[PDB]
Amino acid sequence: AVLIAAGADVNAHAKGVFFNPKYQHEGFYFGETPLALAACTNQPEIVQLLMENEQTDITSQDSRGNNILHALVTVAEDFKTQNDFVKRMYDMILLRSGNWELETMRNNDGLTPLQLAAKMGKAEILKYILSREIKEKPLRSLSRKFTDWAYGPVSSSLYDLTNVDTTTDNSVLEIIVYNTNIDNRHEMLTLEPLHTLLHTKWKKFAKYMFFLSFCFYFFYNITLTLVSYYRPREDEDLPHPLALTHKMSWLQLLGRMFVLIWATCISVKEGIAIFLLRPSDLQSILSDAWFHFVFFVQAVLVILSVFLYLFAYKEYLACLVLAMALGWANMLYYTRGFQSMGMYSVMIQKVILHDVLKFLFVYILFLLGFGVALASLIEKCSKDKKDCSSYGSFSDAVLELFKLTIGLGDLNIQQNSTYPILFLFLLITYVILTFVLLLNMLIALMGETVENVSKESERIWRLQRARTILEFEKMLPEWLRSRFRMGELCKVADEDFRLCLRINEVKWTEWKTHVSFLNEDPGPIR
């Protein structure tokens, strides 16, 4: 305070490399101004000392384009690691300014402080901003939550939907759903305006478009199965019924034509969806774009079986059978619409990654290891000239040890072995390692995985259904988006209309007299 009165510049910028570090262990980014340093290092007395000085530029902006409110979002962390002082510095600076100028300012990559919290995954600052209700009378215009009426326990609130709904570009809802970088997307969609807004989209249009998507893809797999199972099975009856290369005036020939149309509609539409969303990270393919990738492969093999048919290579029938078996396995995508079967498909994804792939690595090491050792111990079968042993090859001994595991066939030890006791020692050692050890430890490890992901399988399901809703919304035309629009215009303040969303509550603990309602008459008027 002595240096301030003596005339030090309160608007200096620290532009060095230490104050803009490349890595987190190199320096300390705080916002480059002495106002941002006092705010980010938990010194509230120097902050309110600086804001009283009339030379203080509170809307200044650094080299990144950040202001004081962008800088507090960047340094925010959890409750456990840091504290909740960043949430209190955000509130104290905002109420001192008194207008919307800090909240609508955009940095160099074009983000407001509200969009920057959702981009980086700051779940505690984002919870504050969306439900911000100010009871004070002159500063009530800075709120985003308004109490419409109240009577006893019952109350009705209004949430502002300005940049959180998908009417503009880069909404809060769009950034959270499509953010492959952060790893807490499924915790940020439980917030109280974002939870109701997805439930309203599912009731009005998304559940009916999800049922029409199911019926077309079911009929596509029926008419692909029937024209492949009921072929003309002769060499004289050579032409294939698909694409209708011979006109015999057959009724319902469009079923051979509906396959070719709908296969090109898929492979074009799935080639675009892969081309736009390109992850280089492997963990984003298996988490977000598995069914985008596997609907495209199934649709290419149907198209490829036609162009390979006209060249008469007689290898088209390999491509159709792969197209049927992959086609009926893709019907497990449509379990998203139900909660009970949708949480069950999240279990299958976590069990294959964590348990089955570790099992199959160690199993093939034992199968191919004991398979060579048994196969090189059998003599030549020219003494009986046929049928002396079933372990004569490497291909035969691997097949016999695989049937031994799943329990098929019969066990014969009267082989053509050079050493018959050594053949039995290696075979019982195989049964102990696989039947007793590995297959029973697989059950014990799956019970460890199920116990952990049962806490999270509901929130992972709601993230997967939320991605379906926002893709149905992008394809329907513009005049449908005006018809299925959520919210209602509300006279919030003097000449302020904000298109808000209404949510009702009941509270039995907090008793208080009601001031700062909007309406006196507490009913549902009209």
Ligand X SMILES: CCCCCCCC/C=C\CCCCCCCC(=O)O[C@@H](COC(=O)CCCCCCCCCCCCCCC)COP(=O)([O-])OCC[N+](C)(C)C
515 binds ligand X (CB under 6 A): no
The binder of 258, among its own copies, Na ion, ligand X, none, by C-beta within 5 to 8 A per type, is none
Neighbours of 132 (CB within 10 A): 15
**Angstrom distances, CA of residue 521 to CA of 148, 323, 456, 495:** 10, 64, 43, 21
The count of residues interacting with Na ion (CB under 5 A) is 2
> Nearer to Na ion by C-beta: 408 or 421?
408
Q: Does 333 bind its own copies (CB under 8 A)?
A: no
> For residue 497, with 0-12 CB atoms within 10 Å meaning exposed, 13-18 middle and 19 or more buried, which class applies?
exposed
> Which listed option, its own copies, ligand X, Na ion, none, makes contact with residue 272 (CB within 5 to 8 Å by class)?
none
> Does residue 329 bind ligand X (CB under 6 A)?
yes
Tell which positions 449-478 bind its own copies, by CB under 8 A.
449-451, 454, 463, 465-470, 472-473, 476
CA distance 128 to 74: 15
189 binds its own copies (CB under 8 A): yes
Instruction: To the nearest 10°, report the CA torsion of 485, 491, 496, 501.
Output: -40
CB of 457 to Na ion, least distance (A): 18
Instruction: Tell me the window of 117-125, 231-239, 245-253, 299-307 that interacts with its own copies (CB under 8 A).
Output: 231-239
Closest CA to 94 of 37, 132, 146: 132
Residue from 386, 385, 389, 376 nearest 415 by CA: 389
Q: Rounded to the nearest whole angstrom, what is the least distance from the CB of residue 364 to Na ion in the complex?
A: 22
Q: Tell me how crowded residue 120 is: count the other CB atoms within 10 A of its CB.
A: 18
Determine contact, residues 106/151, Cβ cutoff 8 Å: no
- Kindly state the smallest distance separating residue 408's Cβ from Na ion, in Å: 6
Q: Are 33 and 11 in contact (CB under 8 A)?
A: yes
Q: Give Cβ neighbours of residue 104 (< 8 Å, ≥ 6 apart).
A: 112
Q: Residue from 11, 53, 63, 141 that binds its own copies (CB under 8 A)?
A: 141
- Asked if 422 interacts with its own copies (CB under 8 A), we say yes
Angstrom distances, CA of residue 37 to CA of 17, 34, 282, 502: 16, 5, 39, 39
Determine, following the binding rule CB under 6 A, whether residue 339 of this chain makes contact with ligand X. Answer: yes
Tell me, residue by residue from 362 to 401, as one string, x for binding to Na ion by CB under 5 A and - for no binding. Answer: ----------------------------------------
With CA atoms as reference, report the closest residue to 11 among 50, 64, 65: 50
Is 168 among the residues that bind its own copies (CB under 8 A)? Answer: no
Q: What, of ligand X, Na ion, its own copies, none, does residue 281 touch, CB below 5 to 8 Å by kind? A: none
Among 27, 121, 271, 279, binds its own copies (CB under 8 A): 27
Q: Candidates 140-148, 196-204, 443-451, 515-523 — which segment interacts with Na ion by CB under 5 A?
A: 443-451
Give which of 263, 252, 229, 256 is closest to 241, Cα–Cα. Answer: 256
**Out of 310, 318, 441, 493, which residue is the one contacting ligand X (CB under 6 A)?**
318
Of 5 and 443, CB closest to ligand X: 443
Residues of 346-381 as b/e, b for ≥16 C-beta within 10 angstroms? Answer: beebbbeeebeeeeeeebeebbeebbeebbebbeee
Helix, strand, coil content of the chain in percent (nearest 5): 55, 5, 40
Given the complex with ligand X, which of 59 and 452 has the nearer CB atom? Answer: 452
Q: Does 340 bind ligand X (CB under 6 A)?
A: yes
Spatial distance between the Cα atoms of 515 and 501, rounded to a whole number of angstroms: 21
Q: Binding residue per annotation — 407?
A: yes
CB of 148 to its own copies, least distance (A): 5
- Say how far apart CA 73 and CA 39 lie, in whole Å: 12
CB of 27 to ligand X, least distance (A): 30
Q: Strands across the sheet with 154-159, in order?
A: 145-151, 154-159, 501-506
Is residue 301 involved in binding its own copies (CB under 8 A)?
no
For residue 229, what is the enclosing H or E element? helix 207-229
Contact string (CB under 6 A) for ligand X, positions 239-268, x = contact:
--------------------------xx--
Query: How deeply is 159 buried, as exposed, middle or buried, from its count of CB atoms within 10 A (0-12, 13-18, 19+)?
Result: buried
Work out whether 233 is an interface residue with its own copies (CB under 8 A): yes
Shortest distance in whole angstroms from residue 448 CB to Na ion: 9
Residue 25 as a binder of its own copies (CB under 8 A): the answer is yes
> What is the nearest approach in angstroms of its own copies to the Cβ of residue 40?
8
Amino acid identity of 116? L
The contact pattern for ligand X, residues 362-381, with x = CB under 6 A and - = no contact, is -xxx--xx--x---------
Q: Kindly list the distances between the CA atom of residue 282 and the CA atoms of 79, 285, 297, 355, 449, in Å, as whole numbers in the listed order.
A: 31, 6, 18, 18, 22
Among 7, 138, 407, 477, binds Na ion (CB under 5 A): 407
Nearer residue to Na ion within complex by CB, 243 or 432: 432
Total Cβ atoms within 10 A of residue 226 = 11
Stretch that binds its own copies, among 89-97, 152-160, 258-266, 302-310 (CB under 8 A): 152-160
Binding site for Na(+): which residues? 407
Binding site: which residues? 407
Residues lying near Na ion in the complex (CB under 5 A) are found at 407, 447
